[PDB]
Symmetry: D2
């Protein structure tokens, strides 16, 4: 009575009376993620070192060809590509997929946890597919999630019904369901932000951080954690509780994180888990994109922590 | 031509004219690390989940059994065991090994990078082996290093002639030398500390951090990173430069990190790489321990960043 | 444009407008076979040898629980179980599955190629499921095939549309389609039989063997090969051409190979590949079983070789 | 307590007081075999099949590069190379290694068991190293053995003190000693020969085979097995008992199997295990070669079965 991702995705496709097109897409994703996981953990490196006489790029190529081979997609948006990828009519399906094939790639040389992020939209309209099909607010996501290549490889999948966590068993190449209908804690005890940008923070962020270090009601201060890889920091937030923040600063007054393939998928997982995701002014899922590589500030995590910061944001309104 | 850890270790043992006792110890360690890496990556998890037919206890049991079978050790100090472990005479060798089998075990459920830390001493006084044999300053280390289970598994080994990094190719179970004679950058641009303890920081730390966020000469502030796993944070420091700090506070008036199996091995690695490892008042390696589970404050990293902080400590003295 | 088993099985389920029940069954098989493959290649043996302080049976258990977890089966027949396994009504599906979880298990200690064999029937009737549901001639098979754990792991799947070969990539745990719509050679140059039973052969087998060693028309003699594991010998027959034989002798005047889970699946693969499978008197697929563990003589392979022996069988009629 | 090949090899090199040169050679071999096993099992095949981003040539290139880098060899003889390979002086050691990188390469497409055979000689006459250095009788071997890529990967190493079997645990990339000081049964019950050459067999062989099928004393006839892969057939002989034969015929008036890298290593293994290895007229190991690619007839296995056949040869002399 063990549940594999392949079994789960199929039972769910059957409960929803799907034609099996989204099921083929999710299955292709599972496969791409397993292939990326293997390359990240360096299987075969001995060959590069001459035993018998990139990563970001290889990841992009893997996701793009495996997804195109699903015959379920029409428009693909990648952080690595300037322009959206329109699928050849022969393999054109109805889904639009937005992804960051390898997030935190700058951490690659340090061997810190990295990951893959994706958001799936249904093409809403009937004209020739194009970039415009991707420009949907995150509220229209059919599915979203991410894979974390950390001490172990995990796939977190968020759909209308909720959030589920699948652990990769690399011995048999199968994702096993380990956590069902995951719900984030109402209040955590960890805050996560790059405090190296202190001089640049707006007054509301500055004050919140201060409340966390020197609590006015004399409660225990929060612990700090900042891996520097969104997927690692968010996954920790989901599982442990707390808050993650990447607000605006000189690094663009618009934030650093990209809306379509970084913020939306994560905001979607968070909301399905019972938490919040805001830019400080509005909910991330409601922003209407105007550019596929548009950035946006984001704050996400346990609802009580997110609301507390929102209140401060109001005080400085 | 490729160099595996196995060949490198033997070659070095040949040049040093050893009786092959330390060579066996080092081969044993390598085997234990590969075994732990496999467990950490979750191979075989499907069996816990009933495809019909604890990670730190297992790790501890792997290091202990595998080290004893090397017939090269007489005293073992584990973070997991209260008293030192005296090997039976039949299996006695001349080495004392101090290790943390799985560090960052809190971070396990969140899939954050974890690692194994070890330090190797040679039995000095030949009386019946005992706990006191482990009570040697870190300056007396023969070898030290760590295994990081991050996006990929890496083993860093430091000995008198330098520091070398070996990446694990899990396809063939062999560590390949990928970085030779490693040296840390003189000056970095990342600081790593849990600022959630700001309320309890002594003045020197407070000044240094603030100097990093608001550089007097309006230069770029340092970026911040704090994984919460020493092996991860220290490895990023060695590889990319910067400074790592875990000073004394209230909950830990003498620091949290233990001297024999966390601070010493890392201080040794940092020193051979050209960095510094201080308590703020003194070099970590010169401290003569009095308890096997003793704690110590530690600041390590690029020489220029550590020196700068030390200048500040002096100023408040 | 790579085809995985998971993709293939789904497209085929969709072309056939299945409810997705047989698709879930085939997917469970893929998973069980990957798990058996891993245990056969000895992953984890170090643990049995005390690194930190059956196979036939484990295989049976794996197939039985994974199949029962598919919710697509009602009756299971295993070589390892005296009685057929009736599925608990909660997980009862409509398929009957006959399998040998690990064939050639006596070769296990010698590390010779071994394999798994299965035949799938649709329950034909409407009363309580029972052993009687399995007693269908092989001509009523919906699907049949086998997995060979040899120098590499391969899954050969035979369905109404033909035979396809899938190679297991153990790095990503995915079966990849490597040979489509496989057809056996009309005439091969290898014969396979245990000649240690010479004294026991009937006159027709005796004469055929003689024709192969000393060809009456002076053509080159055939080469001999007999691995001793049916799946290995049959797979070689399919891929290379030729004939495989296990006729009657003192080892039961009825042959050794079991009809339901050894001969039928193989006879079915052979026929779909364009070859023949006979007991010498009748086609294997047409025999009406009377016992789930009933044995039957079998001869299979390239059509021209099988007909030649059948002619001799007639001459001695 | 567990014994890995790495530890065993070093331990034996310590007891023998070697300079560690052969120890390095043996560690190199182990690494090369693990690499070949991985390629053979087809890891990464999905890449040949375009998840977008020869086995004997590769094997040959792995053994050669990996052996040269051991700095322990001066002359290499491969089944794949016409002339002996003279290592550059910079990498010269004192050992001559004769090997078949991938034996049974015909059997590759059929996924039948394949293996690697090697024999190690010590350079006797210290003149500039050359081909003649490999032309030593098998009685002069320092070490020999083979790696079998069957259902599991095994390495059999024979040296003056005996034969030991090591099973590869692919999860941790380590060979574990599983059978110590192996000895072959005195008398077996399986004979292995390609009876497809019956027409060309000399009288002695003819009589022996017929004696196996129709034992004069009406005892049980011998079972027959002929995988077609020497490593597989010879390994089953060593492990289960019996006799393996590849005598001279017409297509091969001096046998098919080569003396330096197929017959000698196996004869050496058989002898240390308590079996016999003869040409029919003489012991294989006593033959002084005159060509590096020389062929030789070979009969090996349990002493009683081999003796019996030898008695028969004598009778027809
Ligand atoms: N495996 C699945 N899991 C959950 N929902 C699914 C699945 N397949 C299809 N659906 C749902 O049904 C809709 C159409 O399915 P489809 O015909 O495959 O495009 C989707 O867009 C989802 O809303
Ligand atoms: N593998 C090696 N690598 C570096 N130094 C070695 C090695 N083996 C032995 N040595 C050194 O030589 C001393 C004695 O070696 P041993 O006889 O093996 O106990 C050791 O403590 C080290 O200082
Ligand atoms: N994946 C599949 N591949 C080939 N045929 C299928 C598949 N699924 C179902 N079928 C066929 O359709 C019938 C009923 O499918 P099902 O509703 O799943 O039981 C089967 O018994 C087959 O004949
Ligand atoms: N690992 C070992 N196992 C068994 N014998 C060894 C080992 N190492 C060296 N010897 C033996 O000692 C001789 C010289 O060793 P060496 O100095 O390494 O070249 C060898 O030829 C073998 O006879
Ligand atoms: O994948 P990218 O585009 O290289 O950047 C990773 C992102 O960069 C953020 C950290 O940026 P800072 O260094 O500015 O904190 C992380 O949350 C995100 O993963
Ligand atoms: O869980 P461990 O084995 O005690 O390790 C925790 C240690 O804890 C440090 C961080 O602790 P804080 O949460 O107090 O920052 C790390 O740098 C060390 O890995
Ligand atoms: O799986 P089993 O029941 O142990 O037997 C294997 C079978 O046994 C036959 C060989 O039997 P002989 O030794 O009689 O040739 C092979 O074709 C079959 O795989
Ligand atoms: O393909 P190779 O490397 O030449 O090996 C074939 C050899 O061939 C023998 C069998 O050959 P026959 O087909 O002539 O029996 C085996 O025993 C040896 O493995
Ligand atoms: Mn990216
Ligand atoms: Mn990114
Ligand atoms: Mn620990
Ligand atoms: Mn610790
Ligand atoms: Mn069986
Ligand atoms: Mn069987
Ligand atoms: Mn070869
Ligand atoms: Mn050969």
């Amino acid at each position: 009575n063990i549940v594999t991702l392949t079994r789960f995705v199929m039972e769910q496709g059957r409960k929803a009376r799907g034609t099996g097109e989204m099921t083929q897409l999710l299955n292709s994703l599972c496969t791409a993620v397993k292939a990326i996981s293997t390359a990240v953990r360096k299987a075969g490196i001995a060959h590069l070192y001459g035993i018998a006489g990139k990563l970001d790029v290889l990841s992009n190529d893997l996701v793009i060809n495996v997804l195109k081979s699903s015959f379920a997609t029409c428009v693909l948006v990648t952080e690595e590509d300037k322009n959206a990828i329109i699928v050849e009519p022969e393999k054109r399906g109805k889904y639009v997929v937005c992804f960051d094939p390898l997030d935190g790639s700058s951490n690659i040389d340090c061997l810190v946890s990295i990951g893959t992020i994706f958001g799936i939209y249904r093409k809403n309209s009937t004209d020739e597919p194009s970039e415009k099909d991707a420009l949907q607010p995150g509220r229209n996501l059919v599915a979203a999630g991410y894979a974390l290549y950390g001490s172990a490889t995990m796939l977190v999948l968020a759909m209308v019904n909720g959030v589920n966590c699948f652990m990769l068993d690399p011995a048999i190449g199968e994702f096993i369901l380990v956590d069902r209908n995951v719900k984030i804690k109402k209040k955590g005890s960890i805050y996560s932000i790059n405090e190296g940008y202190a001089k640049e923070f707006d007054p509301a962020i500055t004050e919140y951080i201060q409340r966390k270090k020197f609590p006015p009601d004399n409660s225990a201060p929060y612990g700090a954690r900042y891996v520097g890889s969104m997927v690692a920091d968010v996954h920790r937030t989901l599982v442990y509780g707390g808050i993650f923040m990447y607000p605006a600063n000189k690094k663009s007054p618009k934030g650093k994180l990209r809306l379509l393939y970084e913020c939306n998928p994560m905001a979607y997982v968070m909301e399905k888990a019972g938490g919040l995701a805001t830019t400080g002014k509005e909910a991330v899922l409601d922003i209407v994109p105007t550019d596929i590589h548009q950035r946006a500030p984001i704050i996400l995590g346990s609802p009580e922590d997110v609301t507390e910061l929102l209140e401060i944001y109001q005080k400085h309104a």
